[PDB]
Structure formats: C-alpha cells, structure tokens
C-alpha cells in the first residue's frame, strides 16, 4: 500500500506559462496600494534589465547561496 | 460563484464534497429516497464539478480516483467512466481518456439494452480533437471515424455541439488533405446541412428556446460550402 494522497496545509506554488503585459496602471497598484498578481512577479524575473518595474536586491542572490547548499534561512525586518 | 471560488479555498472543497458524497451514499440505503440519489448521481458529474472547482487537475484527478473507492459500484458503472473521460478532454490527456472511454465500452457491452449514444457522442468528439491535432492522413481517418459515429448518433441535443468543430477543421486542417478527403468532407458537411433542415428539430423545443443560434450555425455552414465552391478550380464547377 502506497498512495501519494493530497497535500491540504500548504500550496504548491507553479511558475508562469505567458506573457503578461504590463501596464502604468499594474505599476501603481504594485507600488502605491500594494495589489500584484502573481504573474508579475514571475514576468520581472526572467529580465534582469528590467528596471523600471521592480528593485532586484541582491538578497536575493545571497539567500539562493545559502540554500543551495543545505542550509535553512530565517528573515527578520521592521514594519 | 465568486464566494465558492475565492472565499471557500479548493483545498477544503474536494475534502468537504468527499465527506457530503460519503454520507449521502451511507443513509440512502435505508430511506431509498429519490431525491437522495438524484443529488448523487449529480453531484458526480464532471459539469458541477467544473463549476465547483475552476481548472484544478490534481484536485479533479484525487476526487475521481477516490470516489471509486467510496461506493463499489461505479466501476460496474459506465457513466462514472464517461464522466472521467470527459474529465480529461480541456487538460489534453488523450489516451488516458480513450483508455477510460474502451473501459467504458466494455462496462456497455455487458449491459442488455443499454444505449450507448453518450458515450458514442463523447468517442466521437475524441475523435475531432485527435484529428484536429493531427494532420494528413491520419487525421482524415479519425474524421472518418468521427464522421460514422455521428452517422449512426439519432439526431439530439448533444449532436448540434460537434458541428462547431467542422468550421474549425476547415478553417485550419483543410489544406493538408487531398482532393479525395476534400470531396469526403465536401459531401459529409453537405449530409449534415441536409440533416439539420430536417423537421423533426423544428417539432422539438429544445431547437425552438435557441433558433437564432441554431440557423446561425446553418448559415456558417451554408457561407462554408459556398467557400468550398468558389475555391474549386474552373475546371471541376
């Protein structure tokens, strides 16, 4: 008896499969009200020339490091 | 709609729809109510559960594969596999469901006096679709094996929906074929525009709630057969 089952406390996030445009008005409601689809975010990674739509940090880059290499990450901020 | 698809996550949907199915099938058995088993032979239909859960395969795929298990008796049944079938057909997944549709032509064979349109309709709609990602001749021989399906499908509701996909085929896997399936076709789409001109839909009022769109469709086949002549070369009009 072996049987996969669903998983029902956690999602599993899937990349993207087209183009989305973007616009001025997803632009402001990304910075200004918060609002973004998920879609967007996946758009503004392929591109790293791609500047006038997101800030890259290279946070990023260091955490993917760390975490390539067997190791767990804890990330703390302010408000 | 919004409320069930936003508010009420999918996760908790399946699982919540698994538990209602259980307990609907365990306290039939002793009222044998009819509404009872309206509400389960619906709730398993793969329209509802489209509207219940709005393009989720893996949650679709675990909810037809468990409920088989819940009650025994829809393997015995070939509606169950027609409706896993048709569950399949938008995701692409075509041998799986040609496999489920040959396990649903077995479960019909045993069955006397059994009619079998239903699933003749949803074989022949594979049909246009593989002929439809198909080009050549292996497309004009499932077209033919579509084309002899709905030649013996009685003229029903649920024959008018195929119509829709010759328009496609000629607007996009017409030119690979050959001046014998042209002329095949070419009389096949005349036999379905005499078909539909017959009387007996005009008695039925399923055809008299939606006549516009009905003569709609007539009209675009009739505006196709008139390209398919105008195209002809001058020396076969």
Redesign the interface.
């Given at each position: 008896d072996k049987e996969v089952?669903?998983i029902?406390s956690l999602?599993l996030y899937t990349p993207g499969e087209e183009h989305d445009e973007i616009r001025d008005n997803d632009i402001a409601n990304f910075m200004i009200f918060g609002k973004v689809s998920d879609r967007y975010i996946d758009e503004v990674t392929l591109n790293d020339n791609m500047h006038d739509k997101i800030i890259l940090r290279e946070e990023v880059s260091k955490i993917i490091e760390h975490i390539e290499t067997d190791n767990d990450i804890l990330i703390a901020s302010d408000l | 709609r919004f409320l069930i698809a936003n508010i009420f996550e999918h996760?908790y949907v399946?699982?919540q729809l698994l538990k209602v199915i259980e307990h609907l099938y365990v306290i039939n058995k002793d009222a044998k109510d009819h509404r009872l088993q309206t509400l389960i032979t619906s709730l398993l239909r793969f329209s509802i559960i489209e509207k219940l859960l709005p393009q989720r395969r893996?949650?679709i795929n675990?909810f037809y594969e468990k409920v088989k298990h819940i009650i025994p008796n829809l393997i015995n049944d070939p509606h169950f596999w027609v409706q896993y079938a048709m569950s399949m057909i938008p995701f692409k997944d075509y041998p799986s469901a040609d496999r489920y549709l040959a396990t649903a032509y077995s479960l019909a064979a045993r069955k006397d006096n059994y009619h079998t349109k239903n699933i003749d309709t949803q074989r022949a709609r594979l049909h246009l679709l593989v002929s439809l990602t198909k080009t050549g001749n292996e497309a004009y021989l499932e077209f033919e094996a579509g084309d002899n399906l709905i030649r013996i499908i009685p003229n029903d509701i649920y024959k008018y929906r195929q119509v829709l996909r010759y328009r496609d085929i000629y607007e996009k896997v017409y030119p690979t074929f050959n001046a014998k399936q042209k002329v095949f076709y070419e009389h096949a789409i005349k036999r379905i525009i005499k078909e539909s001109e017959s009387p007996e839909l005009v008695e039925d009022l399923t055809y008299k709630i939606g006549v516009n769109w009905l003569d709609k469709l007539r009209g675009n086949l009739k505006l196709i057969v008139e390209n398919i002549q105008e195209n002809r070369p001058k020396g076969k009009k």
């Open positions: 089952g669903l029902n999602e | 996760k399946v699982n893996v949650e675990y």
